[PDB]
Amino acid sequence: ENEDIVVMETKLKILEILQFILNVRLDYRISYLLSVFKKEFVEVFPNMNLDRIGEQAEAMFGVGKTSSMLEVDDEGGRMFLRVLIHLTMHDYAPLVSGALQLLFKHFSQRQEAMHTFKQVQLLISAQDVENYKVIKSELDRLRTMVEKSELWVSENYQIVKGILERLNKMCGVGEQMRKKQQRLLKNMDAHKVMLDLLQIPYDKGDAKMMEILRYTHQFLQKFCAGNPGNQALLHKHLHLFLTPG
Amino acid sequence: DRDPQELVTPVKFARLWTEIPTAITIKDYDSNLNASRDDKKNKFANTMEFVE
Amino acid sequence: WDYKNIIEKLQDIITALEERLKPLVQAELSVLVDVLHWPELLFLEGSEAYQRCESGGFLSKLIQHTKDLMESEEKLCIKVLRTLQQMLLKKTKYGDRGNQLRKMLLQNYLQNRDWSAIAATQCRLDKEGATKLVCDLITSTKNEKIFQESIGLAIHLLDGGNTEIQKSFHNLMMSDKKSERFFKVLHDRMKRAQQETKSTV
């Protein structure tokens, strides 16, 4: 619509690129955190100095010259900040939205870094990494299907039941693997997705999708075995189960 | 925009204990994926240079 | 190596890092608020952009965009509303380390160098349309969090019983053709609250 739409989009894409670059910088910071943590663990365990770790974390946020290369400008962020301020004053709506978003993100580097570091998941086994990847794929597929369930609430029944059966079969093994996988699923909020599967509006009698609910419930029973934390988290949603059945 | 090219996630949330190094540098951070980046860039290396 | 020990140490380091950097986060947010307070200082004095920032054009654009983006970017609207709330809020100390980080960041970016101050900030925001922004969102918000943030921002606008802000609020109420809905909105909540009280009593 704008007479200079080409230039509008040019700087929109430029900000797109810069946000991607900030994401890569955040990834590098997270990797640095994990590397220093591993170094501390190995040196201590072939106590740990929390003060030195905190000093390194404080330094890497641009406070010292040791993190200058991370900074994306030669003016110490002044050029980037001025660019964002100028863009926020531009007529185009999405350009101003992006400029404001980057401006807010640039003054919240530390909180975002700690949030992401908490979101980081550590696995010592490569087979555990593959298990995490397959669980993530299954959870994403089930979440997408639940989000758009009006189609099946033929081709969307077999896949759902197979995913549920695979998750249930892989959910429980021994006792240590059970706890490990319970914690893993807890981090990815799988319980929320599988609870969203129970709120779908369904007819009184189907005889086919019922088996799905015959499995979705089962997993929740295995998600609480010997895990008071899972019981507590699912207790906040206890009003869902207060239905005749 | 073709089948060989695929989108990438800038931030990775799954990490492996043994793969994590004691210390990390920007050069090493690039180097981990540099093999894939180089073997895929040869097709578009000239366009890469022209764009820069 | 022990997986349990590694996980416990990871949790411990996460907690230590989170605890250490909280005042730093507060200082960074305060630096954001200060930058919004004086956008012109960043720009060159002779540049026309500096004049526009001094005139308040940047804040007017920010408020207009906040009103426009509420429909799509609710999170951004909440963020900007909290930012204005902090702007009106008095300066706060975040510890020696937080104070030092605040000074360093302000010097790096803002290189260029009281109830009365609160009233001045309130009148400036009213001139920029902050009162209009809160009223418009409240009468046109379907999100509870946005309504709460707008009500808080309006409260801060009227904090201290500023006569000018009250007059602007009243004038907007008379002039606005949606004011009825505004009242309705509040009224509706009131009714619900009453019922909720009667539900718990």
Residue with tokens 């015959």: A214
Helix (H, G, I), strand (E, B) or coil at C84: helix
For residues B31 and B25, give the distance between their C-alpha atoms in angstroms, rounded to a whole number: 10
Neighbours of chain C (3+ CB pairs under 8 A): A
Query: Among partner residues A41, A76, A117, which is closest to C9 by beta-carbon distance?
Result: A41
Tell me how many helices (H) and strands (E) chain A has: 11, 1
Burial category of C108 from C-beta neighbours within 10 Å (exposed 0-12, middle 13-18, buried 19 and up): middle
For residues C100 and C95, give the distance between their C-alpha atoms in angstroms, rounded to a whole number: 8
Segments in chain C forming alpha helices (H)? 3-37, 39-42, 48-55, 57-69, 74-88, 95-109, 115-128, 130-139, 144-158, 163-175, 179-200
Q: Which residues of B touch A126 (CB under 8 A)?
A: 16
For residues A18 and A15, give the distance between their C-alpha atoms in angstroms, rounded to a whole number: 5
Closest CA to C49 of A81, A86, A78: A86
| Beta carbons of A12 and A94 less than 8 angstroms apart | yes
How far is Cα of residue A62 from the mean position of the Cα atoms in its chain? 26
For residue A90, give both structure tokens: 């531009």
Q: Is A150 annotated as belonging to a binding site?
A: yes
Provide the b/e sequence for C160-189 (b: ≥16 CB within 10 Å): eebeebeebbeebeeeeeeeeebeebeeee
Closest CA to A29 of C115, B11, C40: B11
| Beta carbons of C18 and C5 less than 8 angstroms apart | no
| Beta carbons of C13 and A122 less than 8 angstroms apart | no
Closest CA to C102 of C24, C36, C27: C27
Do the Cβ atoms of A35 and B16 come within 8 Å? no
Closest CA to C21 of A60, A105, A211, A244: A60
Rg of chain A, C-alpha, whole Å: 24
Phi-psi region of A125 (alpha: psi -120 to 50; beta: other; left: phi over 0): beta
For residues C50 and C42, give the distance between their C-alpha atoms in angstroms, rounded to a whole number: 8
| Beta carbons of A26 and A113 less than 8 angstroms apart | yes
Helix (H, G, I), strand (E, B) or coil at A123: strand
Query: Among partner residues A26, A69, A123, which is closest to B11 by beta-carbon distance?
Result: A26
Instruction: Write down how long chain A is.
Output: 245
For residues C197 and C180, give the distance between their C-alpha atoms in angstroms, rounded to a whole number: 25
Closest chain A residue to C16, measured at CA: A50
For residues A131 and B33, give the distance between their C-alpha atoms in angstroms, rounded to a whole number: 23
For residue B12, give both structure tokens: 């990775």
A1-9's contacts with Cβ under 8 Å and 24+ in sequence apart are A2/A91, A2/A92, A8/A90, A8/A92, A8/A95
Closest CA to C156 of C94, C91, C93, C82: C82
For residue C26, give both structure tokens: 């507060």
For residues A237 and A192, give the distance between their C-alpha atoms in angstroms, rounded to a whole number: 10
DSSP 8-class letter at A243:
S
- Asked if A93 has any chain B CB less than 8 Å from its own CB, the reply is no
Residue with tokens 């309705």: C184
For residues A119 and C90, give the distance between their C-alpha atoms in angstroms, rounded to a whole number: 34
Dihedral sign computed on CA atoms, order A170, A173, A177, A183: positive
Which residues of C sit within 8 Å Cβ distance of A?
Answer: 1, 3, 5-7, 9-10, 12-14, 16-18, 20-21, 24-25, 28-29, 31-32, 35, 39, 42-43, 49, 52-53, 57-58, 61-62, 65, 68-69, 73, 76, 79-80, 101, 104, 108-109, 111
For residues A130 and A119, give the distance between their C-alpha atoms in angstroms, rounded to a whole number: 18
Do the Cβ atoms of A58 and C21 come within 8 Å? yes
For residues C54 and A80, give the distance between their C-alpha atoms in angstroms, rounded to a whole number: 20
Helix (H, G, I), strand (E, B) or coil at A122: strand
For residues C49 and C26, give the distance between their C-alpha atoms in angstroms, rounded to a whole number: 29
Do the Cβ atoms of A89 and C57 come within 8 Å? yes
Query: Among partner residues B10, B11, B14, which is closest to A129 by beta-carbon distance?
Result: B14
Could you tell me the resolution of this structure in angstroms?
Answer: 3.6
Contacts of residue C26, Cβ cutoff 8 Å, sequence gap at least 6? C92, C94, C98
| Beta carbons of A192 and A199 less than 8 angstroms apart | no
Provide the b/e sequence for A84-94 (b: ≥16 CB within 10 Å): bbbbbbbebee
Contacts of residue C177, Cβ cutoff 8 Å, sequence gap at least 6? none
Rg of chain C, C-alpha, whole Å: 21
Helix (H, G, I), strand (E, B) or coil at A207: coil
For residues C186 and A77, give the distance between their C-alpha atoms in angstroms, rounded to a whole number: 44
Question: One-letter amino acid identity for C117?
Answer: A
For residue A122, give both structure tokens: 């550590």
The experimental technique behind this entry is: cryo-EM
Backbone angles phi, psi at A88, to 5 degrees: -60, -25
| SS3 annotation, chain B | CCCCCCCCCCCCCEEECCCCCCCCCHHHHHHHHHHHHHHHHCCCHHHHHHHC
Question: One-letter amino acid identity for C128?
Answer: E
Residue with tokens 């702007």: C87
Question: One-letter amino acid identity for B13?
Answer: F
Q: Which residues of B touch A42 (CB under 8 A)?
A: 22
Rounded to whole angstroms, the maximal C-alpha distance in chain C is: 72
Question: One-letter amino acid identity for A38?
Answer: K
